[PDB]
Amino acid sequence: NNPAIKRIGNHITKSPEDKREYRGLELANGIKVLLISDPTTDKSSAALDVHIGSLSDPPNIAGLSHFLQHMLFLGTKKYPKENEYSQFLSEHAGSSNAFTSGEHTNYYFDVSHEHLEGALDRFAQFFLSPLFDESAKDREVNAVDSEHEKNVMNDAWRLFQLEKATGNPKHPFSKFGTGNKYTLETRPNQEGIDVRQELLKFHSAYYSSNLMAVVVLGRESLDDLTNLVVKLFSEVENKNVPLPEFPEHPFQEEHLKQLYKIVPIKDIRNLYVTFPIPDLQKYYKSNPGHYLGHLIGHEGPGSLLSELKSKGWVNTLVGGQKEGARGFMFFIINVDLTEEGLLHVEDIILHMFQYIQKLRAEGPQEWVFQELKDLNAVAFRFKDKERPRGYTSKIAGILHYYPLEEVLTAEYLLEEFRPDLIEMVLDKLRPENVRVAIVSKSFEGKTDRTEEWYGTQYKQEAIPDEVIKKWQNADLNGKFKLPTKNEFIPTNFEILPLEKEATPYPALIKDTAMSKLWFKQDDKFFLPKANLNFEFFSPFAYVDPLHSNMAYLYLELLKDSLNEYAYAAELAGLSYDLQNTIYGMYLSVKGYNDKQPILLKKIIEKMATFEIDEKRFEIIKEAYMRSLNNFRAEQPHQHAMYYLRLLMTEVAWTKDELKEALDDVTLPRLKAFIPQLLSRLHIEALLHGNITKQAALGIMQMVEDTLIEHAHTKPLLPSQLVRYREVQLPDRGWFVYQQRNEVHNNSGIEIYYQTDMQSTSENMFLELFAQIISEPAFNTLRTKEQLGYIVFSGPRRANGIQGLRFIIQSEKPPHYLESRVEAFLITMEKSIEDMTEEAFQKHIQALAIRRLDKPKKLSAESAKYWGEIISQQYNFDRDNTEVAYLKTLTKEDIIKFYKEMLAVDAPRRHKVSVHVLAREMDSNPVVGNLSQAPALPQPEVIQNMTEFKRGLPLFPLVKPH
Ligand SMILES: N=C(N)NCCC[C@H](NC(=O)[C@@H](CC(=O)NO)Cc1ccc2ccccc2c1)C(=O)NCC(=O)NCC(N)=O
């Protein structure tokens, strides 16, 4: 029949738990398509992935295909308004994004389900007739510059591009994918290039139907989705472009047996070991590099990390196969280094080769392959249902690699045992084929090369033949054993029947001095899993900086010592999260419920009978100090957000206070602190999953009883269950706090307009206003004025209080940023005046859909409940209630809200601004074609955070529901 469709796939294998319906197909023009039908979904979604990317940039215009990616959002022939796509998503509860990697350009969106077609029609135009408007091109190249700029001082981006700079310079692998204003405007103008033509050429040459894959997920029937896709995409034109390939490895003989010493921005010590390998992707049914990676990166007893860590050389290890492109891959073993480790690199590498030699000695092990195959089969039977935007984007990228019928399963199911491929990859991991990189500040001033894009200081040297040889002669070492059978592999999957008195919301089913237990048997997803959440309260976790430090150090010591044993639980889908909070501790255990009370008991029992190892303590202390220091290198906006948390919360210790207090933490002081920490606690828990009320009360009591037995824990007093308050700003005040980022050459600013306490009405005024401004703020402060790449607006909530915040990071100074934000607010008040009733109801409706969007997986529903509980507002039915009220609001309500709390001459404006100056600006003059900025008041400049808090009231806390 149908001329537009080349073929329709057979049944797409799915999990028997997956209620979604599926149909793959190839259009006549060669687009591979997956259609997904989910008649329950609140948001629909599409993605498109083009098998072209950075590796195919013209050598003379680096960043082109990334730049192209930005430009597609900026208008098409059919929809020429620059921001028609974004504004349309925004008005319909949607969102979009896109990335560029060396081989792919991947675009995706989601939207309210009622508006799939609308969104999809705008979206399809990207691939048909983008405008590449000339003035948009001139504007947007700044966003790309900014994007690169945020990366320049990031250690992972520096290392990522350094590796490319050290392979064969002629290989496409050495290209600079991001681009910047120099590569995409300046050098091009100099060399007489018309970038608008170059974008049109590149779009035209590579954006061919035969290199595309599309996924669409909506409520529509499979057939309705089919007609929609055929209608919007079969006009994409087939230019029959050959898929790029890269058979020649970027690392040839000259590039092997090399050592690189590199200077980090942060104080971090790492060792990176790499081997070039062939492309293993075609072997996906057997997956030799995953097998080798599971072994070499294992963390249990017998393992490489185990030895390295006992010797006190390393704390963490990553091992396995790394993506390259079509034609080449890499195999990596990477570790972090202790101060001792750094002096023993030759030896750490030797142990790496001994462990590899052990694998050669034992040969391939079917039983290990079996274990990996079983785990993966279980991961797949019971995978959490995904959010549509990521799912589509992810599936779009893999329609390029697997038959239609296998796209769901291809990355999970294992079929073939291949001792031959396993041997073959193992014979590549040899010292003659090795590359070695060491990162340490100790190389400060001893380097002689500079990487062009990032500025990285490094030195390159042949590894001495004597060293290659000592490595080639790696002997067996008896500290290394293959792992043994994994006892945490779950086998019990029954979904307990829903109990007669089971509730829609969690229920308070235990209310004692020691503990408060919220509980909900899962009535939605029906996977054999559960989430067990615990807040442990204790005034001794945050009483001062020394205690905060200790709470941290203790819990890190605890995790380091459970690691070897927890890691099996982790391979088996049972994981845990354990950290110190400003109120005490937080513990979360999630995964397959089968073996979960076993891991829970081991954790509480380790925690309350813990014995510290002097060697591990000194190593972790030093790491903690670096981590505290390394804050100086986070980015300006992160700094701005951080200082604002310090200014506005009643109690908060600074990184400076914590560093200072850390030299005073001693083994004996820590040994004392723990029993003290645990002597009086209150526990608030949410147990949510495949479990009964009786199992839940049981698990809770098991945690209490363990602490009672081993730490003699007694209940805390209700009065000592103290939450911190937010600083209460004065009607008409404006305060400014200013600092310098010493590393990055950009500013950051956070601006907080504080409104009032959270409550149904104040929540929906703020939230509605934020919905209405959200997209325009992006479109004004970034798309048009191009202030920076990071531009953000939205509700701030803390400590029961709220307001509107702006976060921008920019080359322009903060005083200027502030002036444009104020300009924009005026604009928004006129915009709300000029807007139709219906435009207003649309915003209501879009917020409404956002707030009502149902969780698709257990842990998302747990998150919502956990939010109600740690905030102690306990408003589990908040979404229906808040929306009921929203729907009642009017244009006049929001104008009044703005005029009272937000306008520049508002009677109750409460403003605080953090300015973070870039490395090289020296004063900040704190006050200062384009919209007119109002005149601002002289701000009170904050000199001292503590004084500032002393001199202001504190808000009440929010009464519980
Ligand atoms: N609220 C609306 N309407 N805007 C949606 C924001 C999407 C934006 N995405 C992008 O900047 C790029 C993706 C990327 O950088 N690839 O290289 C894609 C893009 C997308 C939408 C466009 C919309 C109009 C004009 C040009 C656009 C170009 C984004 O993710 N920024 C990252 C962010 O969240 N910053 C915080 C940080 N990184 O810490």
Side-chain angles (χ1 to χ4, degrees), residues 1-499 502-961:
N1 295 35
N2 204 324
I5 306 185
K6 173 154 27 180
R7 59 182 181 103
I8 300 204
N10 311 120
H11 187 255
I12 312 298
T13 315
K14 56 166 167 174
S15 148
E17 302 305 321
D18 199 337
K19 287 168 255 96
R20 290 164 311 186
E21 289 253 283
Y22 293 95
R23 174 174 297 155
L25 63 79
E26 184 172 1
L27 290 188
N29 64 11
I31 302 180
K32 278 138 190 162
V33 175
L34 214 242
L35 309 171
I36 307 165
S37 189
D38 184 347
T40 76
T41 193
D42 288 304
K43 293 202 201 148
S44 300
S45 180
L48 186 141
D49 179 295
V50 187
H51 208 161
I52 278 280
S54 286
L55 262 8
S56 287
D57 283 343
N60 75 132
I61 316 181
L64 192 57
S65 72
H66 173 209
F67 191 30
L68 185 140
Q69 180 226 283
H70 282 231
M71 295 290 327
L72 295 199
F73 282 87
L74 297 176
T76 61
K77 178 184 180 153
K78 188 155 144 178
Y79 293 101
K81 183 164 85 215
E82 195 169 84
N83 70 149
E84 169 67 23
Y85 179 75
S86 281
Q87 187 201 61
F88 181 92
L89 296 181
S90 190
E91 284 172 5
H92 293 95
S95 77
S96 194
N97 220 332
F99 65 86
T100 301
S101 72
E103 294 175 299
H104 296 269
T105 307
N106 178 301
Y107 302 76
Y108 45 91
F109 69 85
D110 63 6
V111 70
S112 164
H113 67 89
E114 329 206 53
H115 296 278
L116 217 219
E117 176 153 17
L120 188 58
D121 185 50
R122 303 169 166 68
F123 178 73
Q125 312 300 318
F126 292 20
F127 318 95
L128 297 164
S129 73
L131 292 181
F132 302 111
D133 181 83
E134 192 80 33
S135 86
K137 160 206 77 129
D138 290 335
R139 267 178 289 110
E140 181 72 13
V141 68
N142 295 104
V144 167
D145 198 51
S146 220
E147 185 181 344
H148 166 73
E149 186 68 27
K150 108 190 148 30
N151 301 349
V152 162
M153 299 285 171
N154 176 103
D155 284 295
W157 286 90
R158 288 159 88 87
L159 263 7
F160 171 81
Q161 184 75 36
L162 181 57
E163 162 177 59
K164 289 156 164 279
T166 63
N168 182 6
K170 321 148 136 275
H171 201 291
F173 186 74
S174 60
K175 297 162 169 186
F176 162 48
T178 306
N180 59 27
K181 163 112 108 196
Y182 178 64
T183 71
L184 236 25
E185 209 192 62
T186 320
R187 176 129 96 347
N189 287 161
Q190 284 168 193
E191 294 179 358
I193 311 187
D194 179 331
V195 179
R196 179 178 189 272
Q197 291 299 311
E198 292 311 309
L199 299 161
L200 285 154
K201 316 249 290 300
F202 184 106
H203 191 259
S204 177
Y206 304 102
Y207 271 53
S208 176
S209 60
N210 75 302
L211 299 190
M212 294 163 179
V214 183
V215 187
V216 180
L217 189 149
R219 292 203 174 185
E220 290 77 358
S221 74
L222 284 190
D223 303 337
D224 286 344
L225 292 166
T226 316
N227 301 326
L228 219 206
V229 160
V230 154
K231 167 220 279 229
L232 304 172
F233 285 92
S234 71
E235 40 176 328
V236 179
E237 179 176 354
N238 193 356
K239 229 87 102 266
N240 249 276
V241 177
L243 224 199
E245 290 175 29
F246 310 91
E248 274 220 339
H249 210 284
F251 299 146
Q252 293 297 128
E253 174 43 17
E254 67 276 27
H255 305 299
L256 302 171
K257 289 183 296 283
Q258 296 316 100
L259 159 68
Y260 302 90
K261 319 207 194 153
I262 298 140
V263 178
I265 303 299
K266 290 183 179 174
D267 194 348
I268 55 174
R269 284 165 224 120
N270 295 288
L271 164 59
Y272 298 91
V273 173
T274 322
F275 310 83
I277 54 157
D279 195 352
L280 305 177
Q281 168 59 38
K282 68 187 188 212
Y283 307 124
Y284 70 97
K285 298 210 165 90
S286 79
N287 218 134
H290 160 57
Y291 172 102
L292 285 167
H294 164 87
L295 262 24
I296 291 167
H298 214 269
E299 279 185 30
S303 76
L304 185 46
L305 213 210
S306 258
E307 194 55 4
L308 298 173
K309 156 196 282 202
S310 281
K311 274 205 171 292
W313 289 341
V314 325
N315 298 309
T316 59
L317 181 155
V318 187
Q321 85 190 319
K322 177 163 136 216
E323 292 301 282
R326 297 227 181 208
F328 66 94
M329 283 192 181
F330 309 83
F331 197 95
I332 56 115
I333 316 171
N334 303 338
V335 293
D336 76 320
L337 292 163
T338 65
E339 320 188 68
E340 269 307 281
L342 176 67
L343 303 175
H344 283 84
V345 164
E346 177 162 5
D347 279 345
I348 286 169
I349 295 174
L350 171 76
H351 288 227
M352 286 174 173
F353 292 115
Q354 292 171 346
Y355 181 93
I356 288 156
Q357 186 45 52
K358 173 72 174 184
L359 300 179
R360 283 184 279 255
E362 293 306 312
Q365 306 284 130
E366 199 179 330
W367 79 265
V368 165
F369 170 82
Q370 263 286 143
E371 181 152 286
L372 266 20
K373 189 265 238 316
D374 295 340
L375 257 0
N376 271 349
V378 174
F380 179 77
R381 182 146 139 76
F382 310 105
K383 176 177 37 70
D384 292 329
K385 179 175 166 145
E386 302 82 355
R387 275 174 284 260
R389 198 236 229 191
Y391 197 39
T392 65
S393 171
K394 180 75 195 142
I395 297 160
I398 69 210
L399 285 171
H400 301 295
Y401 296 87
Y402 302 112
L404 252 25
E405 286 86 13
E406 306 176 22
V407 266
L408 273 32
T409 67
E411 285 192 347
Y412 281 88
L413 311 185
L414 280 190
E415 267 179 48
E416 295 177 5
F417 179 59
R418 280 291 209 115
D420 63 313
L421 304 168
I422 295 166
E423 259 204 35
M424 172 259 109
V425 179
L426 207 45
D427 167 70
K428 298 293 151 81
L429 310 196
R430 292 195 184 279
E432 65 254 38
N433 297 325
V434 86
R435 275 165 65 77
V436 173
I438 308 176
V439 178
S440 179
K441 288 304 197 61
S442 65
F443 294 134
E444 218 30 291
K446 301 189 204 320
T447 80
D448 61 18
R449 289 165 122 118
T450 288
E451 193 280 315
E452 159 159 37
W453 301 112
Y454 280 87
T456 312
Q457 322 284 51
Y458 70 105
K459 190 200 201 144
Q460 167 180 193
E461 310 172 356
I463 299 182
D465 286 310
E466 187 203 323
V467 175
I468 301 297
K469 210 197 102 191
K470 282 174 210 145
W471 290 340
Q472 299 177 321
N473 303 328
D475 209 332
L476 293 184
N477 168 343
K479 259 116 173 28
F480 301 134
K481 289 165 179 137
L482 274 26
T484 55
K485 206 65 177 61
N486 171 352
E487 292 297 343
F488 270 101
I489 293 183
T491 58
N492 177 4
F493 299 120
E494 58 150 354
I495 304 311
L496 291 130
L498 209 61
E499 296 177 286
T503 36
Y505 298 132
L508 181 70
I509 69 159
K510 185 199 225 188
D511 199 5
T512 70
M514 182 106 68
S515 81
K516 209 181 215 206
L517 172 55
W518 304 89
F519 159 81
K520 192 203 172 174
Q521 178 172 16
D522 167 38
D523 66 355
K524 264 136 173 44
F525 316 107
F526 307 114
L527 307 175
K529 283 165 198 186
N531 297 149
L532 312 190
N533 285 203
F534 307 89
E535 253 267 323
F536 294 91
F537 299 95
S538 165
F540 289 72
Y542 208 63
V543 65
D544 58 15
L546 185 79
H547 287 259
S548 190
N549 285 343
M550 290 192 298
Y552 179 89
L553 255 11
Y554 162 48
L555 261 29
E556 295 287 311
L557 280 160
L558 191 303
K559 295 184 307 222
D560 176 69
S561 105
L562 268 183
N563 194 248
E564 241 184 61
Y565 158 103
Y567 179 76
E570 196 174 38
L571 297 174
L574 221 211
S575 71
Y576 83 97
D577 183 10
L578 183 60
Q579 42 217 27
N580 58 124
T581 70
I582 63 196
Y583 295 121
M585 323 185 287
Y586 165 69
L587 210 214
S588 204
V589 179
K590 54 216 149 336
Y592 302 107
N593 68 273
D594 192 5
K595 276 177 176 36
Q596 155 179 90
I598 286 142
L599 175 68
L600 217 203
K601 191 204 158 212
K602 186 72 135 74
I603 296 160
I604 314 300
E605 145 191 311
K606 253 255 195 347
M607 113 181 10
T609 57
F610 192 47
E611 306 220 357
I612 297 149
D613 166 18
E614 160 98 44
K615 265 250 43 61
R616 291 268 89 214
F617 169 84
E618 286 291 328
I619 282 160
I620 288 165
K621 187 156 98 76
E622 190 287 329
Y624 178 38
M625 178 61 84
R626 288 183 301 100
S627 148
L628 281 175
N629 275 319
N630 285 155
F631 200 61
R632 38 142 263 274
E634 294 310 338
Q635 335 210 86
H637 75 291
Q638 276 148 20
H639 281 192
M641 285 163 87
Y642 159 85
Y643 297 134
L644 183 81
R645 257 118 52 187
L646 305 174
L647 282 165
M648 294 299 138
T649 333
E650 189 170 359
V651 185
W653 306 121
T654 82
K655 302 306 188 174
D656 284 346
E657 295 169 323
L658 302 163
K659 287 198 274 274
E660 209 191 314
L662 187 52
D663 290 303
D664 301 301
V665 186
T666 59
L667 199 29
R669 265 116 140 22
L670 236 205
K671 299 187 160 177
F673 161 79
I674 293 163
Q676 157 81 235
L677 220 208
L678 297 188
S679 59
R680 316 190 81 102
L681 309 158
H682 175 73
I683 306 166
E684 195 161 358
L686 198 228
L687 298 186
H688 177 37
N690 182 46
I691 49 184
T692 49
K693 175 179 167 159
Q694 15 313 285
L697 289 153
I699 272 155
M700 182 71 253
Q701 197 59 56
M702 179 226 253
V703 173
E704 289 175 61
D705 288 8
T706 298
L707 291 165
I708 292 163
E709 193 192 341
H710 293 278
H712 318 267
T713 314
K714 322 271 247 74
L716 233 61
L717 283 305
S719 63
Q720 348 179 218
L721 288 172
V722 155
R723 270 342 206 284
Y724 301 125
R725 293 159 179 257
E726 175 161 307
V727 179
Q728 179 191 263
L729 271 26
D731 289 358
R732 276 184 196 285
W734 181 23
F735 306 76
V736 159
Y737 179 68
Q738 175 173 288
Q739 299 266 301
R740 185 91 86 37
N741 188 110
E742 96 193 341
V743 152
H744 289 265
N745 196 28
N746 257 10
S747 310
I749 178 169
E750 177 158 18
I751 294 179
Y752 174 40
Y753 298 92
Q754 164 183 71
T755 56
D756 209 340
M757 272 202 34
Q758 291 161 41
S759 59
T760 300
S761 76
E762 294 292 309
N763 292 163
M764 305 320 280
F765 298 134
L766 179 60
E767 271 169 51
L768 208 207
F769 185 78
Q771 160 64 39
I772 294 184
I773 77 181
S774 189
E775 180 271 324
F778 186 85
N779 182 250
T780 294
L781 278 337
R782 185 178 132 165
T783 307
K784 283 144 95 151
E785 314 195 11
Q786 297 283 151
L787 297 175
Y789 172 81
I790 294 174
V791 170
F792 180 87
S793 84
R796 205 183 100 116
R797 274 62 187 273
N799 303 315
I801 310 305
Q802 66 189 338
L804 208 214
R805 82 225 198 102
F806 290 80
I807 300 168
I808 300 165
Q809 163 167 315
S810 170
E811 197 193 351
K812 290 260 68 209
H815 70 258
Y816 180 78
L817 269 11
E818 197 107 42
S819 164
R820 314 267 81 230
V821 171
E822 295 287 356
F824 166 75
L825 254 15
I826 291 151
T827 283
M828 288 317 293
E829 154 194 34
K830 311 178 195 315
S831 161
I832 299 171
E833 270 149 29
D834 305 339
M835 84 172 36
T836 69
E837 184 59 14
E838 268 312 308
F840 189 82
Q841 294 297 141
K842 260 192 218 165
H843 283 300
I844 274 165
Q845 181 53 23
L847 215 217
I849 287 303
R850 279 179 163 116
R851 291 294 309 282
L852 287 187
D853 186 27
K854 305 179 285 271
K856 335 264 170 338
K857 55 165 167 176
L858 187 70
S859 73
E861 193 190 343
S862 305
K864 287 169 72 67
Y865 304 146
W866 197 235
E868 294 301 331
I869 291 157
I870 63 175
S871 79
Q872 322 216 256
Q873 308 193 3
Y874 305 104
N875 188 352
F876 293 126
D877 185 45
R878 171 193 306 282
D879 297 330
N880 297 119
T881 285
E882 278 176 9
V883 172
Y885 177 84
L886 208 219
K887 263 165 175 160
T888 251
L889 256 35
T890 69
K891 198 145 87 96
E892 141 246 24
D893 290 311
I894 303 294
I895 312 266
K896 284 164 165 184
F897 169 67
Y898 168 87
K899 264 153 165 61
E900 204 194 337
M901 321 288 310
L902 295 189
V904 59
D905 59 14
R908 304 224 261 138
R909 174 171 261 219
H910 309 124
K911 196 172 158 192
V912 197
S913 299
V914 176
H915 294 11
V916 180
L917 306 182
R919 205 205 312 145
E920 310 296 340
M921 331 175 153
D922 295 330
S923 90
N924 180 40
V926 342
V927 189
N929 40 305
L930 297 173
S931 75
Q932 186 53 58
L936 305 178
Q938 213 42 45
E940 185 157 330
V941 183
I942 295 157
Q943 228 80 253
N944 176 293
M945 287 184 169
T946 305
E947 278 168 35
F948 168 80
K949 299 184 198 166
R950 279 173 65 237
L952 293 177
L954 302 168
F955 271 99
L957 292 334
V958 177
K959 296 178 209 88
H961 170 288

